[PDB]
Structure 1
Amino acid sequence: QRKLEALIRDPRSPINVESLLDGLNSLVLDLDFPALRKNKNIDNFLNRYEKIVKKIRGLQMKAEDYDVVKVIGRGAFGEVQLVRHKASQKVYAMKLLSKFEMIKRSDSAFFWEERDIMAFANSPWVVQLFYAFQDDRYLYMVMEYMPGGDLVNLMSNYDVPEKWAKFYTAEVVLALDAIHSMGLIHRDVKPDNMLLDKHGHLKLADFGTCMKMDETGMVHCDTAVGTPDYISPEVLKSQGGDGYYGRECDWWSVGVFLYEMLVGDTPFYADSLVGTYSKIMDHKNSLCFPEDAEISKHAKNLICAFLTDREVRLGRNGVEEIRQHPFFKNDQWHWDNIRETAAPVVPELSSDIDSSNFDDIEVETFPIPKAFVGNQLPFIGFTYYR
């Protein structure tokens, strides 16, 4: 029964006090309705607990605790805010996830791996989570602000030379190796998930697609997940079923990245989704480089070494194959020390709320239930404090 005490005390454990308090709060939120209270059992419970549950919710970190400096991006499940915490006066990036949209889309699991990784990864390659908290309508993740913007915005503001791509590719490679070392494969690696810190250096940021590996480093996934341009043939095929693949599905995503960075378009671009999907399946035929956009044989070799079948893909035998590829040989940095060299683009920040490397941006609650629907159950255990 001291064994029990350990589980509760561990912030990594799904039955820690904050997750047990989520448990009581979500039960009271999903029972307290006129209809359900006709049930004695439910009235007896809500009479006993409802009052103290409100008192507790009082102390819980709220949205109003933060000033919203401005919006730096909008997802399908809601927006990411540059915010300043009122009390501490510290600046964060806060991601909102609409519980209504996640419930409605039958999509209320993706965030667990994302929270786990940002909360506990403790890597200089992984954007860091300080606070997860929820209210009746929203999930909140309060992360460190990455004021350098994403690479999608860098690549569209600069002609990127090989010397830059070497750097940015190496940092992505080390970042994924970090993610892999935590027993996770990422699956949706792309420039939108690659963020630049105050010093111009890279950090992975979106993790909704990440999956625990077997004891044998494989996964059984029968869902084709991640964004179409950057998805691997093996992951696309695995929608047809009997999906069984390892982390080499991420080295594909890097090859695609490297191609886009040097060529100027994705290598399997098409007008439709199903067009891009068709091209990717046919990658032995479909991949080729424009008769102009010039690329050193080393760069072109690495790309094609990455954009092959899983069985012969660079990084199957491990990440050191990648590291000692001719393309990466350079005078600026070694792999031991890259993240303390000078980045190709060091951002010009004016203040702690400068969001100039982010483009500008510019009503749907739940209905009262008939009987128990359990709308808050999918988010028991989210709440996290550092």
Structure 2
Amino acid sequence: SHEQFRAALQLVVDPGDPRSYLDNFIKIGEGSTGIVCIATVRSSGKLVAVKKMDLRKQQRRELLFNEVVIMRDYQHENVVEMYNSYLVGDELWVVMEFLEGGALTDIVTHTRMNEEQIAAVCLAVLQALSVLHAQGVIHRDIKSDSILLTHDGRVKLSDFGFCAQVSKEVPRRKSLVGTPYWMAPELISRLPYGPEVDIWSLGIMVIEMVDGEPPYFNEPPLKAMKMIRDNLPPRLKNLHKVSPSLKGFLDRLLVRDPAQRATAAELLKHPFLAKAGPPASIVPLMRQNR
């Protein structure tokens, strides 16, 4: 399988090895799928990001196809740009734009975003999610970690390893995939589900942006899942701090019944999002200048 797998993924990536154009490979980050470096473009010193993923250290090898194909087939102003992809020894390397502002997590833990910033992030992610979902691609790991910000405050969705796809032959998925505290109740209770699982996860991210963390963050994952499963839509701790409009918006997201749950298409027309500020309004929340 290992060699079968390598050969197959050799066919879906660009050939060769990007040392050809890149210098100064320095690690900066590190997730489960694996590490991340910056490198520079030898002829210009344009900075890229390179994610290095060991084909042998994966839990589900086949999820690696997503790391490449989602960014190649859904280019969009709110999706992280991929330049190329490669097999190097037995690592998959994906070269992407480097987004100087980091992940949304850094912000939501250290500062309190205003509604302008929140709407901005909400529009962004919904635009990406309208396009993926129009093609029947479910993201399945919407959270603040999954979101990157440029220096200039544009938002892009990242981390597509968990994507799955839906059609007429398989209209629902059935896998227990996602991050426990951001997982939809139908997903958790192992009911077949569609792209509505993203919208619930988007809600939970709004709660990040307002309260600093999602519900039951202090419970161990399996117990937390039990609670999302069993309890009603979670309350904002800082309810009293949010406008009627952010609440109107969030109530359309955290709906236990996925059918009553608003779609990304429906939500782009919500007036909560008129509130959305430029790229430049988000820029002060970055650790650099903050």
TM-score bin, normalised by smaller chain? 0.7 to 0.9
2:283 maps to 346
Match 2:223 to one of 275, 283, 290 = 275
For 1:234, the aligned partner's letter is E
Match of 1:99 in 2: 55
* TM-fit CA distance, 1:63: 4.9
Partner amino acid for 2:207? Y
Counterpart of 2:127 in structure 1 is: 174
CA contact (8 A) 2:111 2:285 kept: no
1:287 corresponds to which letter in structure 2? P
Matched, 1:79 2:35: yes
- The Cα shift of 1:270 comes to 3.3
Separation of aligned partners in 2, 1:21 and 1:259: 38
What is the correspondence of 1:200-349 to structure 2 with a 5 Å cutoff?
A: 200-215=153-168, 218-221=171-174, 223-238=175-190, 243-284=191-232, 287-290=234-237, 294-309=241-256, 310-315=258-263, 319-330=264-275, 341-346=278-283
The residue identity in structure 2 corresponding to 1:158 is T
Change (3 A) 1:186 1:77: closer
1:131 corresponding residue in structure 2: 84
Deviation at 1:287, TM superposition (A): 1.8
CA distance in 2, matches of 1:142, 1:154: 25
Of structures 1 and 2, the larger Rg is shown by 1
- How far the C-alpha of 1:266 sits from its partner, in A, is 0.7
- Contact persistence 2:127–2:268 (CA under 8 A): no
Higher strand share: 2
Equivalent residue for 2:26? 70
Kindly indicate whether residue 17 of structure 2 is the aligned counterpart of residue 61 of structure 1. Answer: yes
Per the alignment, in what secondary structure is the counterpart of residue 154 of structure 1?
Answer: helix
C-alpha displacement at 1:261, in angstroms? 0.8
- Inter-partner Cα distance in structure 2 for 1:187 and 1:253: 8
Gaps of 5+ in 2: 1-6
Supply the distance in 2 between the matched residues of 1:184 and 1:236 (Cα, whole angstroms): 19
> 2 CA distance for matches of 1:142 and 1:314?
35
Distance 1:174 1:268 in 2: 28
TM-score, normalised with respect to structure 2: 0.85
- Structure 2: how far apart are the matches of 1:189 and 1:21? 26
Contact kept in structure 2, 1:217 and 1:246, CA below 8 Å:
no
Q: Structure 1 residues 77, 291: closer, same or farther in 2, change over 3 A?
A: closer
**Alignment check: 8 A CA contact 1:183 1:217 kept:** no
Measure the CA separation in 2 of the matches of 1:232 and 1:20.
33
Report the identity percentage: 27
Q: Offset at 1:132? A: 0.9
User: Map of 1:181-192 to 2, 5 A cutoff?
Assistant: 181-192=134-145
Across the aligned residues of Structure 1 and Structure 2, the Cα RMSD in angstroms comes to 2.9
CA-CA distance at 1:346 after TM superposition: 2.5
1:254 is displaced (CA, Å) by 1.0
Distance 1:275 1:63, change over 3 A: farther
Alignment partner of 2:259: what SS?
helix
Instruction: Number of aligned residue pairs: give it.
Output: 280
Which one of the candidate residues 92, 95, 108 is aligned to 1:155? 108
Q: Confirm or deny that 1:119 pairs with 2:72.
A: yes
2-side partners of 1:63 and 1:280: how far apart? 46
Counterpart CA distance in 2 for 1:314 and 1:142 is 35
Contact 1:121 1:182 in 2 (8 A): no
CA-to-aligned-CA distance 1:87-123 (integer Å, 9 cap, x gap): 5643210000012312xx3x21112123111123221
Mapped partners of 2:279, 2:159: distance in 1: 25
Structure with the larger RCO, 1 or 2 (CA within 8 Å, 6+ apart): 1
